[PDB]
């Protein structure tokens, strides 16, 4: 509320204006200029493709950074009076960086199939090109967001585990299960991204 | 087996057991254990001696602190003292009591310093009431004056630049003087309640007019100044007494020694029947006769004239570990233990790491000039071993680097070679001039003449294989790449394949060792239905990738550039079982059957480890007649952890490529941004500028790459040596020795 | 993706770990059983060395007395809390301030009631808690009317905000000081509850029950204490907290009470208070109401420690460890009286 | 032929490589300084000991500079949209990886200095975690190179 | 005495490194004429005539490896003298 009021104001004003212009277009019989086809076609697929390429590691690295810091603060805070837990809790940060590893390998996979063309009108660019661009952009978005939330989740559970482990030193072996169950979704996003971008044949 | 037998019992009662354990702990080959019944600390057969030792230790700590307050050092050149066994030590501490007794007198006379400060305030009173208050409390003070008096009084302050000694703590705490003027007696009354809250109790209450008061105060102040100047002679005797601190530092050393002795005797056995006080000890077998020698030393002093011998005894518990380390391998074992403490009878990973760490650092330090620089650093540190070890140093960085001089030297020496094969020495390529790429009439034979005219603005990649060129290079990497504008693509492909291949082989080396220990501990259920599925799974998954990548490297010639396949697409295809009939050609004949068989056997490998073994454990348990559900829970957690973890480790091997690329790029830019400008047109004043330019360049590479990023690379090597290596066979659950060597 | 858990640690991760480490220093039942067998105070110090409390009696306490033990315990308290405070940013800083306000009020009323008797003027400093020390701890000796006390407290001591418009009196006798205590504590509880509910998140959920219980506890205590005294009933009605679960019957049933029977008939209506009052039957052999209240208090704080990102793990913690100090003192008292008859009256923790 | 808008996007990428990454480094340094204050009064001997976080922030800046220079030399008047969007993607990815790494190092550095202020043995531990922060930046830089070819 | 070795030994090591690498650079720029693989930069814009200009200017550029190293030749000698002053 200190400064988020500005964000809420922008959000509400934007959506109110969107509703107003939408209804204004609709009742004026002026819907033929709201051509979604023009927007989706006259925008070159390269912009979508490179946005996807960037996002696919943008979000993964963001999630990894969030996880490392949220676990790091707790582990080092607890280690001040319990030095024995200092090295034992490396596994949480290992799992946190695993999502970045997955993100970068996905970027390598997606980065292929980037053959430039010379078409200039949509009929010349063609269905295969448009499908390839849209599909790989979507796959990039999916892997990015999935890895982000997997990173946040594993960071939180690792923080909890590290905090608890300082007390009773026979607890670490019964809390990694939640960690693995967290990493599962990070892998699921990767495989869905592959399934999406399987059949790209840009050219 | 890092050791055979340590847990034994080789003690007996003696009239002078203190010297027995003194010699035993001088020998430094034991670690005691006793007190299973857990009789509390506050009722021990040897408690009173421990208590009086604690008292003497606190008292000498007090005198040590006091002499440290006087900034008088200690001579640490004394030799290792000798244990003063007999009870006479206590009486000697009574002598030492006398020392501190006179010390107490000094503190009494330190209160005399109060009076000194007293007169000193009157000095600044040469400037209806006045007083001396703390400087830092002026603002709340004057606000309080505003509240109580509402401005009817007035205040003015002054301060002395020299800080003023404290009667109580001795600190040079700031002080200040204030003068307040009133109008009536009610204010004179009420203001003291506020003034006493700010510690001002030395007031020259008004006696006479200003002049006569000033003269009287002056006279008395000079007289009392002469008096304090006379009476400050106590400092001489105080220093004379204080100079005697050095004498009993060796006494303090041996005080700690016999206090620790009595502490061990506190833990020693609780039974005193028939003079039998046997306490169990941990001492490795190879040193057993050494213990016997210590026993003889006991009989040199203890007049009991008893054999003091006793037999060894086995144990059903878990003994500790020990790592005899020579001079050269100290830091490596420090690192390995820093990962964790190995269980008894574990494969020490020192001989592997001691050579795989420089090799990996070199795999991520592909540059030769920097190898020379690091090797020069290492030789400088090493050659002054005798000088530095016989020296007083303070910087902790220097201490850790001097502890790691061995690793630093080895990774510098390996960095030299790996940089040489990299062919990237200071961003350039050491060209032995064996390039066999382009000669003019050959290029003109391939229909290419005078195309540089249009080429003055474009780049003109040449398609390979005109039919008269090729040639690999024995000397590592062919040099011409160093200026090719497309060097990045081939370099990155090469690094990708490099990193993956090395990681797979190193991981196989890591995982292949557990079978040794499994056969050693004689656990058939953990090898037949254990390591076998793990290795077959790993091999069938990733050795396939290795064979495929070598196959693509060796077989597909240049002329078949089109239609050539992509390896990752094939791997993903087999992972998803999709079988397109067009768009990618099979790698080799018979692909379908072999690939399908490998994937199905890999999948069929999991249920063995997932389900079979606990059924057999329950079978034998029932044959006898153990929570079976718990057993399969733990096993299944282990198996899914192995599968997912091994995928993660195989994926995590790209840091090698990452760091190599970062090194390459950073070296190029560091060359080509600052000192590239050194190439110029000047005739006389050019080398002059080059002087400062190279000075700056050398310093910047020192401060960007030699120190901090190299540290990051080294820690990454360490992380790889820990997690993706030792999480396959290293259980890491044990205890080292905490020897009774005196200190 | 919960509301309050994403951003907690970014500036409150280190201190949280430090306090959670320090919470292991509470002694379980085994240590109390161990420590109840000491034969002298020196024995108690020897055992205290082996626990997390070790090494705070390396002084020249040859004639060791309970006074030094209490002083060292409180010294450990204040040094630890001050170190914890000096590493905190603004929200946690207001929180820890709000904590120390309680001891500040206690010290102020201790000093005014001491100086009400003219026999003592300046020897009252060592008794006051060092934690509740502000710059004007000595201005209390100049207040002849509570208006002057307000004028002394106004400037820097923020306690003004708790009584700036709640006290209007010109004569300072020995009766009204209890009114001062009650009103100041009332305002403190109200303000703390409002701050907690503003802070929002899991802190409110995990700290509302504690403050509610404290409010009802003080309400009941002030009701029972005022039975056979000169305090009028309307003034008593003008002194209850308004943050507990006794809101209606607090102002509609307690004020109409005149003996223990009616207080019983009001407390038995709720389950937990019925149980607490039945347990404290006021029999000669049974513990008084205060002990049962302390037992419930420790139970609530112990229950409060099961939430990861809750601010009150600081506040709760302090209270708990303070109780621990009290326990130790009682044991030593028996060692001073040379009898173990009532040594089992301690209230175990954890 | 190519549109005139094409030169826009690529240039913008360079700006990101010298805004976002830099900003992350800035935060890191600031936070570390605060830590030093809390540690300076009690353990004065370890001031230079804590030179390690601040440099480990500045390295992020260095990375940005590298990529920026590269994208200042591949810029030419006749750029197709393909190249422009490749370069924009590289700049965005490297800037954001730098930013995230900067935030991580800043928080970890505060925690590290505060922890070592009371426990010398914690020193090595903090260093370990700090490495995992810095490496994140490198990952961003990686794709930049991959996007100067494909 | 003046300029004690504690703050100058790094100067000597830097001077040694500078002189050795500058001699190396000059030698590989003159004898080998700094083949373009080890050297992109040169000094001209019109080189459509023939090879005499390229090698001539390469010799001129290598000649500049003189005062450059010579500068240190001396600075090292001065710093050693300052080190000697005890």
């Amino acid at each position: 509320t200190g400064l988020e009021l500005l964000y809420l104001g922008i959000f509400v004003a934007f959506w109110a204006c969107m509703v107003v212009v939408g209804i204004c277009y609709t009742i004026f019989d002026l819907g033929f200029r709201f051509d979604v086809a023009w927007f989706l076609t006259e925008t070159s697929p390269f912009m979508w493709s490179n946005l996807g390429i960037g996002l696919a590691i943008s979000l993964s690295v963001v999630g990894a950074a969030w996880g490392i810091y949220i676990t790091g603060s707790s582990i080092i805070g607890g280690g001040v009076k319990a030095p024995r837990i200092k090295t034992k809790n490396l596994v949480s940060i290992i799992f946190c960086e695993a999502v970045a590893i997955y993100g970068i390998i996905m970027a390598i996979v997606i980065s292929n199939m980037a053959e430039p063309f010379s078409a200039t009108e949509p009929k010349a660019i063609g269905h295969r090109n448009y499908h390839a661009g849209y599909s790989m952009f979507g796959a990039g978005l999916t892997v990015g967001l999935s890895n982000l939330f997997c990173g946040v989740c594993v960071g939180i559970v690792g923080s909890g585990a590290a905090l608890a482990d300082a007390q009773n030193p026979s607890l670490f072996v019964k809390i990694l299960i939640v960690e693995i169950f967290g990493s599962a979704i990070g892998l699921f996003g990767v495989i869905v991204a592959i399934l999406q971008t399987s059949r790209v044949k840009m050219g | 087996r890092s050791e055979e037998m340590t847990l034994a019992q080789l003690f007996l009662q003696s009239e002078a057991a203190y010297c027995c354990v003194s010699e035993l702990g001088e020998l430094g080959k034991v670690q005691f254990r006793d007190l299973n019944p857990d009789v509390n600390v506050f009722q021990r057969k040897f408690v009173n001696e421990v208590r009086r030792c604690e008292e003497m230790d606190r008292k000498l700590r007090f005198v040590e602190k006091e002499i440290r307050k006087a900034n008088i050092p200690i001579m640490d050149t004394g030799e290792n003292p000798e244990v003063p066994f007999p009870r006479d030590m206590i009486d000697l501490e009574a002598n030492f009591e006398k020392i501190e007794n006179e010390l107490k007198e000094i503190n009494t006379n330190q209160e005399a310093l109060k009076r000194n400060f007293l007169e000193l305030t009157e000095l600044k009173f040469i400037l209806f009431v006045a007083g001396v208050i703390n400087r830092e409390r002026i603002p709340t003070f004057e606000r309080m004056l505003w509240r109580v008096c509402r401005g009817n009084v007035f205040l003015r302050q002054a301060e002395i630049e020299n800080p003023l000694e404290d009667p109580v703590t001795g600190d040079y705490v700031h002080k200040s003087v204030f003068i307040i003027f009133f109008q009536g007696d009610q204010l004179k009354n009420r203001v003291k309640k506020i003034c006493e809250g700010f510690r001002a109790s030395l007031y020259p209450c008004p006696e006479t007019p200003q002049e006569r008061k000033e003269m009287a105060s002056g006279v008395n102040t000079r007289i009392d100044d002469l008096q304090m100047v006379l009476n400050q002679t106590e400092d001489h005797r105080q220093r004379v007494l204080q100079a005697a601190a050095k004498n009993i530092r060796v006494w303090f050393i041996k005080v700690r020694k016999m206090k620790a002795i009595y502490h061990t005797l506190n833990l020693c056995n609780i039974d005193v029947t028939q003079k039998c006080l046997i306490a169990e000890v941990w001492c490795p077998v190879t040193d057993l006769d050494s213990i016997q020698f210590a026993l003889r030393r006991g009989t040199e002093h203890s007049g009991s004239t008893v054999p003091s011998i006793l037999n060894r005894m086995q144990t059903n518990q878990t003994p500790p570990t020990y790592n005899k380390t020579n001079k050269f391998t100290h830091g490596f074992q420090n690192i390995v233990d820093a990962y964790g403490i190995g269980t008894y009878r574990e494969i020490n990973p020192a001989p592997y790491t001691v050579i795989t760490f420089p090799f990996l650092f070199a795999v991520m330090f592909g540059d030769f000039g920097h190898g020379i620089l690091m090797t020069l650093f290492a030789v400088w540190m090493v050659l002054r071993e005798s000088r530095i070890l016989s020296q007083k140093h303070e910087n902790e960085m220097f201490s850790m680097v001097f502890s790691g001089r061995y690793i630093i030297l080895l990774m510098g020496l390996f960095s030299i070679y790996t940089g040489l094969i990299y062919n990237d020495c200071f961003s350039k390529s050491l060209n032995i001039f064996g390039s066999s790429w382009s000669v003019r009439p050959m290029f003109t034979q391939g229909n290419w003449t005078e195309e540089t005219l249009l080429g003055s603005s474009v780049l003109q990649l040449n398609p390979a294989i005109p039919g008269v060129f090729g040639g690999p290079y024995p000397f590592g990497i062919d040099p011409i790449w160093n200026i090719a504008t497309n060097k990045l693509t081939f370099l990155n492909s090469f690094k990708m394949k490099m990193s993956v291949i090395l990681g797979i082989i190193h991981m196989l080396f890591g995982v292949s060792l557990s079978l040794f220990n499994h056969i050693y501990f004689k656990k058939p259920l953990n090898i037949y239905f254990g390591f076998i599925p793990e290795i077959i799974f790993m091999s069938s998954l990733f050795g396939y990738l290795v064979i495929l990548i070598f196959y693509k490297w060796t077989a597909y010639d240049a002329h078949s550039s089109r239609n050539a396949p992509s390896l990752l697409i094939h791997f993903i295809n087999m992972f998803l079982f999709s079988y397109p009939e067009s768009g990618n050609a099979m790698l080799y004949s018979g692909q379908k059957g072999i690939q399908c068989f490998l994937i199905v056997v890999a999948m069929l490998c999991v249920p063995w480890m997932l389900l079979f073994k606990p059924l057999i454990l329950r079978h034998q348990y029932l044959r006898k007649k153990f929570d079976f559900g718990d057993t399969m829970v733990h096993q299944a957690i282990h198996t899914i952890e192995y599968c997912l973890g091994c995928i993660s480790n195989t994926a995590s091997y790209l840091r090698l490529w990452a760091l190599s690329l970062a090194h390459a790029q950073l070296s190029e830019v560091l060359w080509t941004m600052v000192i590239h400008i050194g190439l110029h047109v000047r005739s006389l004043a050019g080398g002059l500028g080059l002087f400062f330019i190279f000075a700056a360049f050398a310093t910047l590479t020192v401060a960007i790459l030699l120190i901090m990023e190299g540290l990051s690379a080294f820690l990454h090597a360490l992380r790889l040596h820990w997690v993706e290596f030792q999480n396959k066979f290293y259980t890491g659950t044990g205890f080292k020795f905490l020897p009774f060597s005196f200190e | 993706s919960f509301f309050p858990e994403l951003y907690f640690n970014v500036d409150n991760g280190y201190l949280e770990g430090l306090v959670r480490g320090l919470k292991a220093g509470v002694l379980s039942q085994a240590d109390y059983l161990n420590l109840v067998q000491c034969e002298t105070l020196e024995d108690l110090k020897l055992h205290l060395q082996s626990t997390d409390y070790g090494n705070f009696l390396a002084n020249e306490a040859s004639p060791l007395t309970v006074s030094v033990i209490d002083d060292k315990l409180k010294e450990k308290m204040v040094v630890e809390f001050r170190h914890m405070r000096n590493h905190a940013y603004e929200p946690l800083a207001s929180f820890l301030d709000f904590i120390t306000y309680s001891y500040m009020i206690d010290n102020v009323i201790l000093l005014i009631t001491g100086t009400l008797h003219q026999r003592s003027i300046a020897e009252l400093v060592p008794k006051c808690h060092p934690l509740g020390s502000f710059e004007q701890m000595e201005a209390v000796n100049i207040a002849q009317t509570p208006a002057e006390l307000y004028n002394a407290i106004l400037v820097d001591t923020p306690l003004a905000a708790f009584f700036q418009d709640c006290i209007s009196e010109q004569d300072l006798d020995e009766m009204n000081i209890e009114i001062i205590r009650n009103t100041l504590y009332k305002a403190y509880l109200e303000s703390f509850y409002k701050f907690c509910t503003l802070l929002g998140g899991t802190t409110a959920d995990a700290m509302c029950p504690i403050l509610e219980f404290e409010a009802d506890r003080r309400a009941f205590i002030i009701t029972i204490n005022s039975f056979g005294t000169e305090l009028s009933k309307e003034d008593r009605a003008k002194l209850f907290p308004h943050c507990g679960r006794l809101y209606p019957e607090g102002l509609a049933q307690l004020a109409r009470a005149d003996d223990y029977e009616q207080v019983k008939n009001v407390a038995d209506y709720y389950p937990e208070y019925k149980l607490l009052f039945e347990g404290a039957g006021s029999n000669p052999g049974d513990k008084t109401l205060e002990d049962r209240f302390f037992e419930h208090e420790v139970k609530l704080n112990k229950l409060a420690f099961l939430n990861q990102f809750h601010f009150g793990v600081f506040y709760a913690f302090v209270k708990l460890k303070e109780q621990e100090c009290r326990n130790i003192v009682w044991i030593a008292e028996c060692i001073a009286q040379r009898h173990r008859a009532k040594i089992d009256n301690y209230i175990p923790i954890f | 032929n190519n549109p005139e808008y094409s030169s826009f996007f690529g240039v913008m990428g360079a700006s990101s490589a010298m805004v976002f990454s830099a900003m992350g480094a800035a935060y890191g340094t600031a936070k570390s300084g605060t830590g030093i204050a809390a540690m300076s009064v009690m353990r004065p001997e370890l001031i230079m000991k804590s030179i390690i976080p601040v440099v480990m922030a500045g390295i992020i800046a260095i990375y940005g500079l590298v990529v920026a220079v590269l994208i200042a030399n591949s810029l030419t008047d006749g750029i197709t949209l393909y190249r422009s969007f490749l370069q924009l993607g590289a700049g965005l990815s490297v800037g954001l990886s730098g930013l995230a790494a900067g935030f991580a190092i800043g928080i970890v550095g505060d925690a590290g200095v505060r922890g070592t202020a009371q426990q010398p043995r914690l020193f090595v531990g903090m260093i370990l975690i700090l490495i995992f922060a810095e490496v994140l930046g490198l990952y961003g830089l990686i794709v930049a190179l991959i996007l100067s070819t494909k | 005495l003046c300029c004690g070795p504690k703050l100058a030994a790094c100067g000597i090591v830097l001077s040694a490194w500078g002189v050795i690498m500058l001699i190396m650079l000059g030698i590989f720029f003159n004898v080998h004429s700094a083949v373009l693989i080890e050297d992109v930069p040169f000094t001209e814009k019109d080189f459509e005539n023939g090879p005499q200009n390229i090698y001539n200017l390469y010799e001129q550029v290598s000649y500049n490896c003189f005062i450059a190293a010579g500068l240190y030749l001396l600075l090292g000698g001065f710093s050693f003298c300052q080190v000697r002053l005890n």
Side-chain angles (χ1 to χ4, degrees), chain E residues 49-60:
Chain E
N49 174 217
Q52 219 205 328
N53 284 8
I54 83 189
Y55 287 101
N56 195 330
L57 286 162
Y58 264 106
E59 282 191 354
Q60 303 313 0

Side-chain angles (χ1 to χ4, degrees), chain B residues 315-452:
Chain B
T315 196
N316 206 346
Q317 305 74 299
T318 306
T321 77
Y322 183 76
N323 270 330
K324 170 53 58 177
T325 330
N326 57 65
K327 144 174 184 177
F328 165 80
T329 72
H330 183 21
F332 303 90
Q333 199 56 231
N334 287 123
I335 295 158
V336 159
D337 284 353
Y339 176 50
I341 308 85
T343 172
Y344 206 56
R345 313 155 294 187
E346 207 170 339
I347 309 309
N348 197 319
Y352 306 127
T353 291
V354 71
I355 184 55
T356 318
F357 210 121
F359 171 51
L360 279 198
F361 202 71
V363 166
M364 324 177 285
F365 214 109
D367 167 36
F368 166 58
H370 281 60
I372 278 177
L373 311 208
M374 225 54 198
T375 294
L376 258 296
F377 203 120
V379 164
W380 160 58
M381 301 276 308
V382 163
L383 279 170
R384 308 200 176 196
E385 178 271 348
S386 55
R387 305 191 254 213
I388 296 299
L389 247 192
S390 296
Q391 199 166 359
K392 163 48 191 61
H393 256 295
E394 76 290 337
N395 185 343
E396 290 99 355
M397 295 336 132
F398 262 34
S399 71
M400 49 168 216
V401 172
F402 204 110
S403 282
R405 78 232 205 210
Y406 312 139
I407 79 171
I408 272 283
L409 180 57
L410 280 199
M411 68 193 88
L413 268 283
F414 262 72
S415 280
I416 270 178
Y417 162 85
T418 188
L420 177 63
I421 169 162
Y422 223 84
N423 203 27
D424 194 337
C425 173
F426 276 127
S427 147
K428 289 319 182 180
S429 34
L430 254 295
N431 216 324
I432 320 98
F433 303 102
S435 298
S436 70
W437 280 108
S438 168
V439 166
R440 171 64 173 204
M442 337 310 164
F443 206 0
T444 73
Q445 180 263 327
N447 273 318
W448 197 116
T449 60
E450 297 312 313
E451 277 162 56
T452 207

Side-chain angles (χ1 to χ4, degrees), chain E residues 15-80:
Chain E
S15 60
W17 182 241
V19 59
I20 181 171
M21 154 175 328
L22 283 182
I23 304 152
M24 191 85 98
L25 271 187
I27 278 305
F28 255 45
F29 266 41
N30 174 276
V31 171
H32 271 327
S33 69
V35 315
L36 214 68
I37 285 133
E38 260 198 302
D39 156 84
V40 152
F42 72 107
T43 74
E44 198 37 53
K45 191 261 194 201
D46 309 346
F47 266 6
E48 297 97 298
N49 174 217
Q52 219 205 328
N53 284 8
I54 83 189
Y55 287 101
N56 195 330
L57 286 162
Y58 264 106
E59 282 191 354
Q60 303 313 0
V61 165
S62 83
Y63 154 72
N64 199 79
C65 288
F66 174 48
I67 324 101
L71 295 174
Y72 301 64
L73 183 56
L74 295 174
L75 177 63
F78 257 132
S79 210
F80 214 80

Side-chain angles (χ1 to χ4, degrees), chain A residues 70 73 77 80 156 160 163 167, chain C residues 5 9 13-14 17-18 20 23:
Chain A
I70 188 52
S73 100
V80 60
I156 275 189
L163 168 39
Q167 274 56 32
Chain C
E5 82 204 351
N9 303 53
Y14 166 82
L18 198 55
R20 289 258 209 205
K23 63 177 172 61

Side-chain angles (χ1 to χ4, degrees), chain D:
Chain D
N1 310 99
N2 59 53
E4 252 298 358
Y5 295 121
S6 50
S7 153
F8 170 65
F9 304 103
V11 180
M12 189 133 297
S15 97
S16 97
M18 208 45 44
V19 170
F20 288 144
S21 40
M23 227 154 54
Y27 179 52
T29 282
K31 191 67 186 224
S32 320
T34 296
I36 303 315
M39 172 267 255
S40 34
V41 175
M42 248 191 72
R43 319 293 301 286
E45 270 305 359
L46 309 99
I47 288 304
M48 292 276 246
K49 278 290 311 312
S50 202
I51 200 175
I52 34 166
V54 303
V55 286
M56 271 193 95
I59 170 154
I60 280 181
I62 300 313
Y63 284 6
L65 177 59
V66 156
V67 87
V69 165
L70 180 61
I71 186 46
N73 287 338
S74 187
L75 271 192
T76 152
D77 189 323
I79 194 192
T80 42
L81 269 304
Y82 181 97
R83 283 182 273 176
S84 320
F85 287 138
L86 290 208
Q87 304 343 317
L88 153 59
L92 174 152
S93 99
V94 80
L96 212 28
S97 292
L99 194 64
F103 284 171
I105 165 173
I107 295 317
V108 165
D110 176 333
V113 165
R114 296 264 178 73
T116 36
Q118 226 84 37
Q119 179 47 294
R121 181 175 299 89
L122 274 190
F123 169 82
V124 57
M126 67 174 282
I127 266 286
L128 205 169
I129 297 301
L130 257 194
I131 294 314
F132 281 68
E134 184 264 12
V135 60
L136 282 193
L138 264 189
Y139 272 71
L141 174 85
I142 275 179
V143 288
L145 282 309
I146 306 309
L147 290 181
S148 58
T149 88
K150 172 182 278 175

Side-chain angles (χ1 to χ4, degrees), chain C residues 4 24 29 31 59 68 75 95 102 112 140 165 170 256 285:
Chain C
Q29 85 62 16
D31 323 284
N59 82 91
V68 182
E75 190 62 72
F95 195 71
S102 150
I112 178 174
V140 306
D165 307 311
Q170 313 333 320
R256 297 143 85 166

